[PDB]
Amino acid sequence: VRRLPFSTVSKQDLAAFERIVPGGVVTDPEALQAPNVDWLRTLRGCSKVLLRPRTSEEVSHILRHCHERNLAVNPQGGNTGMVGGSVPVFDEIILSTARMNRVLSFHSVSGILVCQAGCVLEELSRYVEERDFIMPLDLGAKGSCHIGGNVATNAGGLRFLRYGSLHGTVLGLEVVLADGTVLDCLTSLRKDNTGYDLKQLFIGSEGTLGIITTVSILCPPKPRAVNVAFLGCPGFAEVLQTFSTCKGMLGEILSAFEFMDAVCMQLVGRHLHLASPVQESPFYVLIETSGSNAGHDAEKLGHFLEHALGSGLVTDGTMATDQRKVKMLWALRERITEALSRDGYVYKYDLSLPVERLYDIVTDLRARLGPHAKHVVGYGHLGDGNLHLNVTAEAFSPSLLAALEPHVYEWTAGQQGSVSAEHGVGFRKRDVLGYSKPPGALQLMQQLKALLDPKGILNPYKTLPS
Amino acid sequence: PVRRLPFSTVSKQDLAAFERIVPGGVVTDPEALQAPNVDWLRTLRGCSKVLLRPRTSEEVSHILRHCHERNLAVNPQGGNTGMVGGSVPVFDEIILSTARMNRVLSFHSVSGILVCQAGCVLEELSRYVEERDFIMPLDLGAKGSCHIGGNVATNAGGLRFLRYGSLHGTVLGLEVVLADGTVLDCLTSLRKDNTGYDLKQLFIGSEGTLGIITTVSILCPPKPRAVNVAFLGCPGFAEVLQTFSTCKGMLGEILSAFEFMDAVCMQLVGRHLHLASPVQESPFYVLIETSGSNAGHDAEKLGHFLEHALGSGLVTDGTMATDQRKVKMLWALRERITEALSRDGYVYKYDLSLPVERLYDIVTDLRARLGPHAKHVVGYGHLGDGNLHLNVTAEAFSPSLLAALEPHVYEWTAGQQGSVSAEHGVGFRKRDVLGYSKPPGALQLMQQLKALLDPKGILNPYKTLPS
Numbered sequence: 024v025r026r027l028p029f030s031t032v033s034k035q036d037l038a039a040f041e042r043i044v045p046g047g048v049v050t051d052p053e054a055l056q057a058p059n060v061d062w063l064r065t066l067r068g069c070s071k072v073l074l075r076p077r078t079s080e081e082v083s084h085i086l087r088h089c090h091e092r093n094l095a096v097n098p099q100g101g102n103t104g105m106v107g108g109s110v111p112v113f114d115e116i117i118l119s120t121a122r123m124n125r126v127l128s129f130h131s132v133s134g135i136l137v138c139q140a141g142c143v144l145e146e147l148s149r150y151v152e153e154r155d156f157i158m159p160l161d162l163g164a165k166g167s168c169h170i171g172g173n174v175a176t177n178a179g180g181l182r183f184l185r186y187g188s189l190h191g192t193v194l195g196l197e198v199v200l201a202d203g204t205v206l207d208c209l210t211s212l213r214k215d216n217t218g219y220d221l222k223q224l225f226i227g228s229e230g231t232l233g234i235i236t237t238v239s240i241l242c243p244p245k246p247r248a249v250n251v252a253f254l255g256c257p258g259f260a261e262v263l264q265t266f267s268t269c270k271g272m273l274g275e276i277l278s279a280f281e282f283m284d285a286v287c288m289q290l291v292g293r294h295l296h297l298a299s300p301v302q303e304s305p306f307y308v309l310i311e312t313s314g315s316n317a318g319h320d321a322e323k324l325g326h327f328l329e330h331a332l333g334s335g336l337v338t339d340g341t342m343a344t345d346q347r348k349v350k351m352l353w354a355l356r357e358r359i360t361e362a363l364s365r366d367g368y369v370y371k372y373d374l375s376l377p378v379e380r381l382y383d384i385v386t387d388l389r390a391r392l393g394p395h396a397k398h399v400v401g402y403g404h405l406g407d408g409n410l411h412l413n414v415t416a417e418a419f420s421p422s423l424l425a426a427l428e429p430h431v432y433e434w435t436a437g438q439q440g441s442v443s444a445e446h447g448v449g450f451r452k453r454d455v456l457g458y459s460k461p462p463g464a465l466q467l468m469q470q471l472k473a474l475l476d477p478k479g480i481l482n483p484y485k486t487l488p489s
Numbered sequence: 490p491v492r493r494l495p496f497s498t499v500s501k502q503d504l505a506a507f508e509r510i511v512p513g514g515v516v517t518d519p520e521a522l523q524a525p526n527v528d529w530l531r532t533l534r535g536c537s538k539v540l541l542r543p544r545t546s547e548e549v550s551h552i553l554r555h556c557h558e559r560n561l562a563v564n565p566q567g568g569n570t571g572m573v574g575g576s577v578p579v580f581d582e583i584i585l586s587t588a589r590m591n592r593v594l595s596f597h598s599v600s601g602i603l604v605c606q607a608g609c610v611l612e613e614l615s616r617y618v619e620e621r622d623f624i625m626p627l628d629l630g631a632k633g634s635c636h637i638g639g640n641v642a643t644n645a646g647g648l649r650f651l652r653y654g655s656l657h658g659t660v661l662g663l664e665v666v667l668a669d670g671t672v673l674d675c676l677t678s679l680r681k682d683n684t685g686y687d688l689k690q691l692f693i694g695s696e697g698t699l700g701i702i703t704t705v706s707i708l709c710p711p712k713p714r715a716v717n718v719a720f721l722g723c724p725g726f727a728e729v730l731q732t733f734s735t736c737k738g739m740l741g742e743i744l745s746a747f748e749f750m751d752a753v754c755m756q757l758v759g760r761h762l763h764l765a766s767p768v769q770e771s772p773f774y775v776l777i778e779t780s781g782s783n784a785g786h787d788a789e790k791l792g793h794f795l796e797h798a799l800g801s802g803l804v805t806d807g808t809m810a811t812d813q814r815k816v817k818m819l820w821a822l823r824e825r826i827t828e829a830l831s832r833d834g835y836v837y838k839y840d841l842s843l844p845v846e847r848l849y850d851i852v853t854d855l856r857a858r859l860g861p862h863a864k865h866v867v868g869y870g871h872l873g874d875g876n877l878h879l880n881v882t883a884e885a886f887s888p889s890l891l892a893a894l895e896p897h898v899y900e901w902t903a904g905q906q907g908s909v910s911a912e913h914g915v916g917f918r919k920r921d922v923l924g925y926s927k928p929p930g931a932l933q934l935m936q937q938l939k940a941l942l943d944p945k946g947i948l949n950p951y952k953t954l955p956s
């Protein structure tokens with residue numbers, strides 16, 4: 024809310040940065056407009072310096088200078104984050120990983136990838152798929168998001184159900200600390216219990232404890248067969264039974280289970296001009312499978328589909344194994360958040376709730392907000408108990424905010440849920456962590472922040488309580 | 490040797506305080522303290538004069554509060570199956586046992602989330618969840634004695650790591666008592682939760698130097714409908730490696746375990762445990778487990794895999810089982826190797842992560858470097874994860890053999906950019922060889938974490954950071 028007492032960038036600081044990062048000092052005000060605005064376009068900083076280092080040493084030297092000079096630094100990746108973590112609040116120096124985009128090594132047998140933090144996720148997927156491997160995560164933001172940002176936010180995504188957390192799949196990190204110290208935890212071993220797993224501190228730390236410069240990550244083998252079933256369900260009870268039956272009948276080949284409601288389908292059709300491939304339904308389910316024997320997978324899907332259609336769990340369904348149609352079906356899900364931001368002002372909640380009551384809050388909000396909301400939608404990673412809850416309005420209303428908050432957070436706390444399942448904390452959620460974390464946890468978090476960055480130059484105003 | 494730090498000593502008043510805090514949970518009899526003072530390998534013995542066995546987290550908090558005010562060192566202990574001396578005192582540290590913290594708090598039969606006290610025995614948790622059609626995400630030969638809290642504190646790997654991955658992924662939450670007795674509630678029984686720093690990760694693999702784990706929330710995989718085991722003899726390590734490659738290519742996602750052992754391992758398990766080999770005599774053996782939803786499909790995958798492996802000469806003889814009894818018999822040949830080794834004599838033990846293509850090199854090397862001074866040299870373990878268990882047995886310890894083994898093995902491993910402790914951890918034994926796997930700045934940051942969380946150093950002194 025109020026700017027902390029950091030120094031201001033002088034002409035000598037600019038000349039120092041030009042010495043440290045020749046060619047990577049952007050000060051043109053019109054060029055700084057895009058990096059000062061967050062993805063949702065509801066936060067806008069006033070930073071006058073963007074730095075674009077090429078190497079880890081340049082990052083170390085930048086932070087050394089900023090530490091001696093007490094200048095605040097805002098690390099930025101693809102700038103697709105949803106919680107205002109990725110843009111300055113005031114005049115923080117924006118340190119971009121855009122030019123830190125080289126792959127350093129890839130072991131064609133172990134599947135271990137070592138790459139710079141600014142490698143774009145989509146580009147890494149292409150790279151490892153050319154070598155019959157895949158990234159352990161994928162996101163709708165794949166085209167822009169940086170692997171460094173994925174690690175910093177502990178991104179979940181669309182294959183989390185199968186491959187799990189970056190806490191498991193990240194094998195090593197090189198991190199530059201606030202004073203410039205380079206911390207080498209960049210091991211490439213599957214198993215290494217030689218002391219504390221320090222890298223874990225930086226996974227989900229959202230740039231407040233250090234700048235991730237190099238990532239080593241375990242890539243799963245590329246599946247021989249990927250199938251997608253897009254199904255229409257006549258209610259949420261049937262969605263939940265489709266999930267239970269899916270786990271019973273598909274089992275280890277399951278790689279994704281996503282859901283969306285009718286209003287989501289209507290919004291992607293309206294704003295993105297994507298047609299539905301199945302009959303109109305109150306709910307849609309996207310199931311992905313990934314396996315090594317295409318025939319066994321096809322048989323599993325056949326028997327699953329036959330039972331689900333036969334027992335009335337699914338009303339209408341389409342299947343795809345062709346890469347093009349698979350991408351078509353996936354686009355209906357991946358681009359929901361975009362269609363929502365085109366419907367007007369978006370109130371965005373990212374909740375972990377018991378799966379059996381994942382949609383209850385959507386119905387509650389629809390009753391609580393009558394004609395004062397444009398739309399209330401629920402979609403997301405049902406398999407992981409993760410609901411994306413969005414409310415759209417024709418314009419922002421402080422009235423509608425008072426109706427939504429704290430109510431939504433209180434409901435989540437009443438379910439012992441998470442008020443930020445995936446997207447993290449950043450600027451937006453720094454003062455609502457008490458609904459998911461007790462004061463002693465938040466206190467230890469503050470102690471770690473003070474140990475690793477005593478001057479608080481890395482990402483001020485985030486991601487700890489005020 | 491190592492010098493005792495200036496901690497206080499246990500007085501009669503401390504014994505009365507502990508008797509207040511945990512009624513009936515204070516053991517002072519010297520003959521009773523014998524067993525908890527000796528490590529699993531029986532080569533380290535502490536001189537602790539008090540064992541505390543609390544039942545509840547509040548009791549652990551109050552115990553540690555008292556020890557913090559009094560400057561009394563504390564040695565947390567679970568199943569006491571640890572391999573690196575972390576589990577027993579060096580001098581007179583108070584032994585804090587989780588043996589009586591053995592309750593299951595809750596289990597959700599849909600999400601598969603287990604919440605239980607740290608002292609629940611792994612095998613007993615397995616029986617509990619399997620009755621409900623789930624399994625534990627980890628398994629190990631110590632299952633009969635090790636505590637889930639010990640597994641989290643050591644970041645235990647084990648026999649199904651290849652399928653379900655690290656505890657860093659499968660642990661959903663922890664309740665931890667800090668050195669001053671503060672109860673840290675990170676007990677988040679949620680699949681996903683990005684509300685600040687993932688503090689629990691610090692305590693996974695911290696071996697009781699940053700806090701005492703009292704409650705665990707863990708994700709339990711569903712119980713597989715079909716489990717198969719194949720046990721195969723391979724004529725050389727190259728064929729072992731191609732059997733692994735082929736196994737991944739043909740079994741794929743249903744693979745749940747890949748373990749190897751050498752001929753000497755088989756001989757020792759046969760000689761000491763009287764377990765006959767079910768395949769023709771071979772220089773290497775491989776145990777493969779699969780876990781899947783469809784028996785027919787898994788059987789087809791295994792049949793084709795076996796066809797191709799036997800066809801191209803990667804495997805000389807093989808046997809398969811689905812009957813639970815026979816599956817367990819085959820698993821016993823691998824699980825009980827460590828016991829047979831400790832029955833063979835004094836054991837020099839190394840637990841290394843190496844490039845899989847070079848996993849067995851050190852064994853051949855040491856067989857040549859050592860002579861008749863080694864009774865046996867063996868290599869076995871989690872080949873799918875790049876993890877070698879290297880062991881040398883002899884009739885008795887000798888300084889000469891130790892000098893031939895060390896630092897040579899650790900320098901070899903560093904030469905391969907490997908880990909000198911893949912899964913067993915550091916503890917007392919390996920505290921001064923971390924430089925072979927970790928750079929100075931990381932070790933310093935670890936020391937700063939220790940100073941922040943335990944500035945008095947009462948939790949597991951003389952471990953698991955450098956001196």
Ligand SMILES: Cc1cc2nc3c(=O)[nH]c(=O)nc-3n(C[C@H](O)[C@H](O)[C@H](O)COP(=O)(O)OP(=O)(O)OC[C@H]3O[C@@H](n4cnc5c(N)ncnc54)[C@H](O)[C@@H]3O)c2cc1C
Pocket residue numbers: 062097098099100101102103104105107108109110120140161162163164167168169170171172173175176177178179180181229230231233234235236357360361445446449482485
């Ligand atoms: C269409 C769309 C779909 C999405 N889908 C998902 C999804 O399925 N799951 C999910 O979890 N999220 C999802 N997200 C949001 C997600 O948080 C980001 O897309 C992703 O994590 C990558 O963020 P980024 O690379 O853009 O990092 P940025 O947005 O640039 O930064 C995010 C935060 O991390 C910090 N940071 C960035 N780079 C570094 C670095 N190198 N070192 C240290 N700190 C750094 C920033 O300071 C900021 O606090 C989606 C976003 C969009 C727009």
Ligand SMILES: Cc1cc2nc3c(=O)[nH]c(=O)nc-3n(C[C@H](O)[C@H](O)[C@H](O)COP(=O)(O)OP(=O)(O)OC[C@H]3O[C@@H](n4cnc5c(N)ncnc54)[C@H](O)[C@@H]3O)c2cc1C
Pocket residue numbers: 529564565566567568569570571572574575576587607628629630631634635636637638639640642643644645646647648696697698700701702703827828912913916949
């Ligand atoms: C036959 C056999 C097979 C094994 N197989 C494997 C294997 O496959 N993979 C593997 O990784 N290891 C294996 N191990 C060793 C492994 O480290 C232990 O089996 C187990 O992980 C530790 O559990 P425990 O309760 O015995 O811990 P202990 O030995 O009692 O203690 C382990 C360490 O953690 C600390 N600690 C214990 N409980 C707590 C707690 N509640 N809170 C904080 N700190 C605590 C102790 O102070 C000590 O430093 C095996 C051991 C044996 C004997």
Ligand SMILES: [Zn+2]
Pocket residue numbers: 179180403404411445
């Ligand atoms: Zn998401």
Ligand SMILES: [Zn+2]
Pocket residue numbers: 646647870871878912
């Ligand atoms: Zn092992």
